[PDB]
Design a protein around this ligand. Sequence first.
Ligand SMILES: *Cc1c(COP(=O)(O)O)cnc(C)c1O
Ligand SMILES: *Cc1c(COP(=O)(O)O)cnc(C)c1O
Lengths: 405, 405
Amino acid sequence: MKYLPQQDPQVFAAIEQERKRQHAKIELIASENFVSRAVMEAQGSVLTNKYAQGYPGRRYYGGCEYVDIVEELARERAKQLFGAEHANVQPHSGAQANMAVYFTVLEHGDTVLGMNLSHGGHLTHGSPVNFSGVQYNFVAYGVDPETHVIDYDDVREKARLHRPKLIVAAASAYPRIIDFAKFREIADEVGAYLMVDMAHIAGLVAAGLHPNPVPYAHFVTTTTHKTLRGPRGGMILCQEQFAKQIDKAIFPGIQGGPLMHVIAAKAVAFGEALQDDFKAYAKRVVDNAKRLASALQNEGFTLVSGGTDNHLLLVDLRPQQLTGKTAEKVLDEVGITVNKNTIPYDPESPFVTSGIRIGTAAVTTRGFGLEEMDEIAAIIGLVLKNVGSEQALEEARQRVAALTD
Amino acid sequence: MKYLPQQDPQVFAAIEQERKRQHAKIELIASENFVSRAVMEAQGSVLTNKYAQGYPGRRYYGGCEYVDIVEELARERAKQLFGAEHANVQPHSGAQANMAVYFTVLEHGDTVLGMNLSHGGHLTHGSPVNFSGVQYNFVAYGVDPETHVIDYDDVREKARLHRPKLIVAAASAYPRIIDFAKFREIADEVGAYLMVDMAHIAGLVAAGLHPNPVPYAHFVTTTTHKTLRGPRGGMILCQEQFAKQIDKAIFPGIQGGPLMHVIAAKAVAFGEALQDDFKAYAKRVVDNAKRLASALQNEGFTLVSGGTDNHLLLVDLRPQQLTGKTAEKVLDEVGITVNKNTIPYDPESPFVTSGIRIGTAAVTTRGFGLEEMDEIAAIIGLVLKNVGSEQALEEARQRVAALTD
Ligand SMILES: *Cc1c(COP(=O)(O)O)cnc(C)c1O
Ligand SMILES: *Cc1c(COP(=O)(O)O)cnc(C)c1O
C-alpha cells in the first residue's frame, strides 16, 4: 500500500494488525480462506467508479463496454467451471443470491423445506430472525440421530406432508456428501423446485471432489468466497429457462448497481479455479480434512457422522464434558481459531453448543499438509484435555507458533 | 497492479480499458464519482479474508479485534460527519440500506408514501418491478407541474388519505433542496415514520451545503458512493431508539457477513469527508452545477425547476424536439456521458424520456471549474442543436478531448 498509510494512519494500522493476525493464527473456521494477490488487486481497481445496473449489452447507462467484458468473463468462466446453462454474478453475497432465488419462485407465506438449522442448515434457510423465516413458511428435515447423515426418508415425508413450493438442500455444517439426485427425486414427487446452496462446497464441486448439483437443481446458489477461494460475494447458477426471471430478481428486483470491481475479482478467482493447480489444492483440502479427522479420533475425540467427506468436520465434545463455547475460548488463547457449532440433537442452546466446527481450506491455502494436520490434532488434544493447565496452554502456544513459523 | 497482469491478462486488459475510458470521457452521470487511491487500497486489502458477522465486540466468530477497530472508525466518523446517534455501515448497497429500514418498520403489504418515480423517486421507492413495490403498498406524491418543486400539500393530502406507516423522502433526479422539516411535520400529523434516502446528496449534506435530514428523520439511508465520494456500498443512520432493531434488520435480518474491506474504505472516505478540502470540493460541485445550469440556459435549454440547488440538473428537451434517448446517444458519440431521464409529467415512456440528467460531482473531482462548465454547456449546445451534422460532432469530439487534455 502506498497512499493509505499517509492518508489514514488509523485505518492503515488496523489493517496491518489484521494482516499480521491472519499470518500468526491457525485459521480453522470452515468458511474462511485466503484470496490471491490478483483477486485483491482486482477489488482495489477503478471499477468501483462505474455504475453498471442492468446486464452486459443491456445496461441502463453508457460507458459500460469494458465492464461488460469483465462481467462476461466471470459468467462464461463460471459456466465452464460448473457446467451451468446460466450464471448471474451480481449477488452482493450468498444471502442476496438466496434472497433472489426466493424472490423468483415464492410468494410471501409460501412453504419451503430446508435442512434443520441445528443439524447443519444455514441462517438463510428459514431462521425465524432472518428474512427467510419471516417472509416464508419454513419446515425442516433432519439427520439420523446416530449416523448424522441426512435422513432422506424424512426429507420425503416432510415434503409429502407439507407440500413445499421449494426444497432447499445444502449446509454450513454438514461433513458428508449430499445426494442431490435424491433431493431432485423428492422435489419431482411433490412438484417442488429444488434449490441447492453449495456455498461451503463450491470449490470442491469445481474440482470434481463433490458431486455437482447443477444437473439436479433448478437453482444453485453459492458464495464466491469459502472453498472456491474467491472475493467476498454471491452467485446464482440456473437452467436457461429461469435465466431471465433470475436476472430480473437480482436487478431491478432486489439489488441496485452491481460491484463491478468485485465481479472482476470473481472472474479472476474463476480463472484460478479452472487451472490444474486449483484442483490439486482442492484435493489437498479434502485429504487434509480426512487426515485431521482421523488424527482427532486418535486423540480420543468423537466426530459428528464419524468423520468427513469434504473440507469440514464437527467435534462432538460431550465425551470431554465441554461446551463448544469453552473449547472455542481456550483454543483462541493458544492461537487456533475455531467456532462453537451446534451438533445434531444438541442438548445445549446455539449460543453455548456441544461442538466445534473445523475446516481445512484456509490452512491448506497456506501450504499445510498431512504432517501439519497430525500436529494440529495433537495440539487440540493437548489443549482440550488440559483446560486448567497454563503449562499445557503455553506449550500449545509455542507449537502453534512453530506451525505458522 | 503487479500480480493481476500476469495471472489474468484478459481481466487486466479490460480493467485497463476502463481506467483509460474514465480519463478520456466527460462523466456527467449524476450518480458517478472517482474515489481516492487510499479508498481503493483499502478495498484491495486482506480484510476480504475475514468473516465478521455480528457487530464490533459482539461478533459470531473470534479474531475480529482489528476489523472491530475498522468498523468503529467507520461508525464514529459517520456519526461526526452527520450528527447521527447511530450508524450501521454494513449495508452492501443503497438498495440493502433501504431494504433493511423497510424490514425494520413494515409488515408485508403496509402502505408507504414516496416520491413519484417519474418526478425523481428512486427504484427502491416502490417500483412495481422492485421488491419495495412488490412487498409493500406504495403510494406517490408529486411535484408541481410548473415549478417542478415537491408539492408539500400533495404530500400531506396523500399521507392523510392513504395513512402510510412510512413516508420516504429523497430522490435520484430532484434538482432542488428538500424540506425535511415539512416532511417530518406531515409524518407527525398522520403518525408515520419518516425515512430520508439522501444517497444523491449525502456529500453535500456532509459539507453543510444541503440541510441535514438527521434531526428530522427516524431513519436516514444513503449510498457511501455518489456525492460522498466513497466506495460502492450502503449506510443507515438512525436515532438511538431504533439502533438495535436496525442492527438486527441488517444482520441476521437481511445480510450475512459484511464486506470488511469495503467497510475499511468507507472509514477512509468518511475521514476524507471530515477534512476541510472535501468541504471546498463540495462547494465547487454545487458552484459548478449552478454555473453549468446557467450556461445551458444561455444555450437556449429549458431546465426542470428552472435550475438547481444541488449537484444535478435535468434538461427538458421538448423545445428542441428531442428525446432523452436521442440526446444520450449523440452525446455518447462525442465522449460526453449522460443518461436519459424522465422529466416530471413526461409525455414519453421511461425508456425514451424527454430529458437528460446531468451532475457535476465527477468532473469537479477531476478538477473542472467554472470555465469548464461554460465549455461543456457550449459543447452540449453545439451537439444537440446540430444532431445531423458530422462536422459539428467532430468539432465537439475535439473540444471534449481538449478538456480531458
Ligand atoms: C456462508 C453461507 C451463506 C452466506 O453468504 P454471505 O456472503 O455471508 O451472505 C449462505 N449460505 C451458506 C450455505 C453459507 O455457507
Ligand atoms: C443510487 C441510489 C440508490 C441505490 O444504491 P445501490 O448502491 O445502487 O443499490 C438508492 N436510493 C437512491 C436515492 C439512490 O440514488
